Amino acid sequence: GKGAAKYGFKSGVFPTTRSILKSPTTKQTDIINKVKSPKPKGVLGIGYAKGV
Amino acid sequence: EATRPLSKRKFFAIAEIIRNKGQQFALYESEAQLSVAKEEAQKAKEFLDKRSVRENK
RNA sequence: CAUAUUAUUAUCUUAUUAUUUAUAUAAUAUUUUUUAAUAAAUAUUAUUAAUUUAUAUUUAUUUAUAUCAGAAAUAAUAUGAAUUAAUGCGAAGUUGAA
RNA sequence: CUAGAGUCUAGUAGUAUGAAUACAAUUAUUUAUAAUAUAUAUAUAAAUAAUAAAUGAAAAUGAAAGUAUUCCACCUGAAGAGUACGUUAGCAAUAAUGAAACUCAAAACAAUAGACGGUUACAG
RNA sequence: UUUUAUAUAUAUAUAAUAAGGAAAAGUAUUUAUAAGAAUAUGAUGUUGGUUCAGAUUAAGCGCUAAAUAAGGACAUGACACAUGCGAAUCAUACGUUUAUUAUUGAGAUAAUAAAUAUGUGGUGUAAACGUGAGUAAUUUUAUUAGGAAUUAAUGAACUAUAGAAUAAGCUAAAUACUUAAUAUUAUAUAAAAAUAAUUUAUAUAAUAAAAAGGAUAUAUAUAUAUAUAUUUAUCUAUAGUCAAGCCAAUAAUGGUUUAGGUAGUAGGUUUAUUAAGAGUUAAACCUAGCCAACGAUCCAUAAUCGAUAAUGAAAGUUAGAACGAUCACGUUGACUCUGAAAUAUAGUCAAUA
Ligand SMILES: [Mg+2]
Ligand SMILES: [Mg+2]
Ligand SMILES: [Mg+2]
Ligand SMILES: [Mg+2]
Numbered sequence A: 001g002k003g004a005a006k007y008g009f010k011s012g013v014f015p016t017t018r019s020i021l022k023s024p025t026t027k028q029t030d031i032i033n034k035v036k037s038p039k040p041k042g043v044l045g046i047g048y049a050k051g052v
Numbered sequence B: 001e002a003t004r005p006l007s008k009r010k011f012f013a014i015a016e017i018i019r020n021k022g023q024q025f026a027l028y029e030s031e032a033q034l035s036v037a038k039e040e041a042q043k044a045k046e047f048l049d050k051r052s053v054r055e056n057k
Numbered sequence C: 001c002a003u004a005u006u007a008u009u010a011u012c013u014u015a016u017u018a019u020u021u022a023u024a025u026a027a028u029a030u031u032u033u034u035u036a037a038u039a040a041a042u043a044u045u046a047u048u049a050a051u052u053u054a055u056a057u058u059u060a061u062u063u064a065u066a067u068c069a070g071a072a073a074u075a076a077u078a079u080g081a082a083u084u085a086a087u088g089c090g091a092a093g094u095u096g097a098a
Numbered sequence D: 001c002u003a004g005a006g007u008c009u010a011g012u013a014g015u016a017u018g019a020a021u022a023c024a025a026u027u028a029u030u031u032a033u034a035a036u037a038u039a040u041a042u043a044u045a046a047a048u049a050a051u052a053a054a055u056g057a058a059a060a061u062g063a064a065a066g067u068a069u070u071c072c073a074c075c076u077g078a079a080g081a082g083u084a085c086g087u088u089a090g091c092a093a094u095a096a097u098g099a100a101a102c103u104c105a106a107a108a109c110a111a112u113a114g115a116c117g118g119u120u121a122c123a124g
Numbered sequence E: 001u002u003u004u005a006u007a008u009a010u011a012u013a014u015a016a017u018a019a020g021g022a023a024a025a026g027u028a029u030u031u032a033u034a035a036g037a038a039u040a041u042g043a044u045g046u047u048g049g050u051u052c053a054g055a056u057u058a059a060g061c062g063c064u065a066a067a068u069a070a071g072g073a074c075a076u077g078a079c080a081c082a083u084g085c086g087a088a089u090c091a092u093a094c095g096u097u098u099a100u101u102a103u104u105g106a107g108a109u110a111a112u113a114a115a116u117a118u119g120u121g122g123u124g125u126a127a128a129c130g131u132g133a134g135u136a137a138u139u140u141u142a143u144u145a146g147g148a149a150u151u152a153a154u155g156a157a158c159u160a161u162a163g164a165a166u167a168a169g170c171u172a173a174a175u176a177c178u179u180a181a182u183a184u185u186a187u188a189u190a191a192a193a194a195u196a197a198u199u200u201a202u203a204u205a206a207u208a209a210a211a212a213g214g215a216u217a218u219a220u221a222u223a224u225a226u227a228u229a230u231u232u233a234u235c236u237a238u239a240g241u242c243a244a245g246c247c248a249a250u251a252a253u254g255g256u257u258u259a260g261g262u263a264g265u266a267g268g269u270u271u272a273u274u275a276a277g278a279g280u281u282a283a284a285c286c287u288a289g290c291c292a293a294c295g296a297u298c299c300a301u302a303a304u305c306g307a308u309a310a311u312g313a314a315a316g317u318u319a320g321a322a323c324g325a326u327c328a329c330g331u332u333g334a335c336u337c338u339g340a341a342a343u344a345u346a347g348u349c350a351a352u353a
């Protein structure tokens, strides 16, 4: 009963709603820009460095 | 950075050297071992040279 | 000293199974060399069933490795124990003077 | 208590108001310097004693038992018990670590009034 | 203060001088909400335990008991089980068996009626149901807008599209089985960039891997075939959906009176296996590592969790019955076939009864 307060006082779970399109569409430019933007390497980095 | 399982317990690989201070330590050790040596040799030469200069006296 | 169950193993035994060795006048398919029985036509010529022959697919036999589970040894996890250590309580008291 | 040396040496062993930082009103003494001309009943400091505020269950503390910060050690009713078992070291002695069941509603601390003591004196 | 004046040696001692004065009327929601009592003492204050007041239950028992509606109901011996049920269905897959009518002469063939699931076949029992033994994580649970090996020429069973559905054998016959025919990856060339690789396109190589007919009608012709249509099946391919396998990070009970543990152990390189990484398993060769007083290893105990239940003011604590999610198991252990997925409640072997 306490945990339900976190979710609007709702007891019981619906199944997680599915996505009609599992991946971003082409017309959705912003996700493409983030995907094809320069990858940051550093203190907060996502890929192997140049010489690594 | 996370990778495929590379062994029983190794699931990460080195991505970037943020700072190479350990490499600096290794290089500086290797350099120092002989860098001090040259100064020691010339110090010994100077010390014995002053010994001889006083010996003339 | 006695009972019980998991775990392991330079040990003993081993179902089945997996690979793995070797052997089959061992089989089955096809390929040869051949032997009988049968058909058509003027000596046959081919056909089926069997004889030898060398490629596959298995069977039996074996070589090695692992292997359920069983023993034997060890250890623990328990359960009981003559014999035995300490301490808790209480009954009205008994004895010392710490 | 153990070894080596001729009684000594070398030992084993490890018992029998935490530390630091910032701050915090006086008085009186001293104490050590710094001055100024014995006198400035001289100022700056630390030691000692009584305080104030503050703290505390109080006794009492009173520049710490106060206001705050940081680090460590320790405590969780009495008795069983620093006992048993196991381990750790030790020739051993010992030491360290260290429970559990049972029993109880106790137990303890400061202070108050008392009667008690060969407790002290003193009187009437 | 500041500015200057005299004097003395840019500076020093003295004397004087000072700019800061403005006025005006009118212009709620406040949030969350925590109480103690008895018992010490000759009496007081404090420490300190013990108990009580509250709510609840997977409840049990004592006494008692009316009707109705709803929610639950072997937590213990994953102990053993009498008896009956819980998984069948398809006759439009193939076969059989009759009755009538017609033609043929005991039968044969058609049409129509039936019977046949004790013969050959297709689909279904990987789910659901129950349970909580094992399991402290070597594959379990929870969470992440987490990943790759950058997961298969896998569709399991429907959708939307195209196509194809051939020949023999063995079965008594076939939609049963065999044999055969026909229908993404690796190379090489370039292009880029989300690049020190991937992707794209092209051209080759092999892809190269299948199938099945029944039910009705009709139309031909010569009962025989054949050819269309309607139905229901079958096979391949693209995508969608639903699904799977693997790894990471954080957390997940008590005992160190369990202090050292680990030799496939920790890491590297190859090979086999897999759709796929990895000492996961098997082989080989190297290095000496890895975990550990922030508690390893070992032991005991336990299925885990929630938007579930109980409680509290809350942090939390407890349960894991009921509702729901995940895992494991179907008397015990190992292995094998099928399959995409199983050490299957299957099969073989063994153990127990
Ligand atoms: Mg009393
Ligand atoms: Mg009911
Ligand atoms: Mg049960
Ligand atoms: Mg029929």
Ligand SMILES: [Mg+2]
Residues within 6 Å of the ligand: E117
């Ligand atoms: Mg049948």
Ligand SMILES: [Mg+2]
Residues within 6 Å of the ligand: none
């Ligand atoms: Mg199942």
Ligand SMILES: [Mg+2]
Residues within 6 Å of the ligand: none
């Ligand atoms: Mg078929």
Ligand SMILES: [Mg+2]
Residues within 6 Å of the ligand: E264, E279
């Ligand atoms: Mg291993």
Ligand SMILES: [Mg+2]
Residues within 6 Å of the ligand: E302
């Ligand atoms: Mg259990």
Ligand SMILES: [Mg+2]
Residues within 6 Å of the ligand: none
């Ligand atoms: Mg639990």
Ligand SMILES: [Mg+2]
Residues within 6 Å of the ligand: E132, E303
């Ligand atoms: Mg369980």
Ligand SMILES: [Mg+2]
Residues within 6 Å of the ligand: none
């Ligand atoms: Mg439940």
Ligand SMILES: [Mg+2]
Residues within 6 Å of the ligand: none
């Ligand atoms: Mg139940």
Ligand SMILES: [Mg+2]
Residues within 6 Å of the ligand: none
């Ligand atoms: Mg099972």
Ligand SMILES: [Mg+2]
Residues within 6 Å of the ligand: E331
């Ligand atoms: Mg049973």
Ligand SMILES: [Mg+2]
Residues within 6 Å of the ligand: none
């Ligand atoms: Mg089983």
